[PDB]
Design an enzyme around this catalytic site. Structure first.
Site, short mmCIF file in Angstrom:
data_model
loop_
_atom_site.label_atom_id
_atom_site.label_comp_id
_atom_site.label_asym_id
_atom_site.label_seq_id
_atom_site.Cartn_x
_atom_site.Cartn_y
_atom_site.Cartn_z
N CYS A 90 -0.01 4.01 2.54
CA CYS A 90 0.38 3.50 3.85
C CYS A 90 1.85 3.79 4.13
O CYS A 90 2.22 4.26 5.20
CB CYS A 90 0.14 1.98 3.94
N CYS A 97 0.83 -1.19 0.00
CA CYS A 97 0.00 0.00 0.00
C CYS A 97 0.88 1.25 0.00
O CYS A 97 1.51 1.59 1.00
CB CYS A 97 -0.93 -0.01 1.22
#
Lengths: 105, 105
Positions: free
Chosen positions: B35, B32
């Protein structure tokens, strides 16, 4: 049918077998509620639309593919044609899915 | 520093260890992008704030925790205090995160 992509090589093979057809790819996870919610609808659509190719990628099983496509909010639907990206949809909005299929098929 | 929750038993241990402090739990994946971009900010907040506890959960490592908390987007931040869910935030919106931290701590 909605074919489950096995790995990066398999993803490439499927994108080729599609020829000139729109490809719709569902990036999902088995722990994802909305993903499970919309999966049957995608399967139903795929059974009728033989001129669109429907694939799915389990992000837990194909983390490398998920990273390649900047996946974040699931389910993510990616729309491709001739191996090239056309559009992307975040979330399980079936009407928006149908609109993007209509647009890009 | 942001502690990585190992499993469900560990999640209860960390929640207990937090005492009365606000707990911010970052649900993330190594694939991600957003993230990864916000992780160092969380580390800095973790190092700086002594009245908040920061945790992280790798959804690929703890799929059951992800399912049980109905995670769909990443990152997702869950805000807990004395074992209670107070709020949730989908996506890497640092300002909103900080707002929810100041509000709930």
């Amino acid at each position: 049918m909605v074919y489950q992509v096995k790995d990066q090589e398999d993803f490439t093979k499927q994108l080729n077998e599609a020829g000139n057809k729109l490809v719709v790819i569902d990036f999902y996870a088995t722990w994802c509620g909305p993903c499970k919610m919309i999966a049957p609808k995608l399967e139903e659509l795929s059974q009728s639309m033989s001129d669109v190719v429907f694939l799915k990628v389990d992000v837990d099983e194909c983390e490398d593919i998920a990273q390649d496509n900047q996946i974040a909010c699931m389910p993510t639907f990616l729309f491709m044609k001739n191996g090239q990206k056309l559009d992307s949809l975040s979330g399980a909005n079936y009407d928006k899915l149908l609109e993007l299929v209509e647009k890009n098929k």
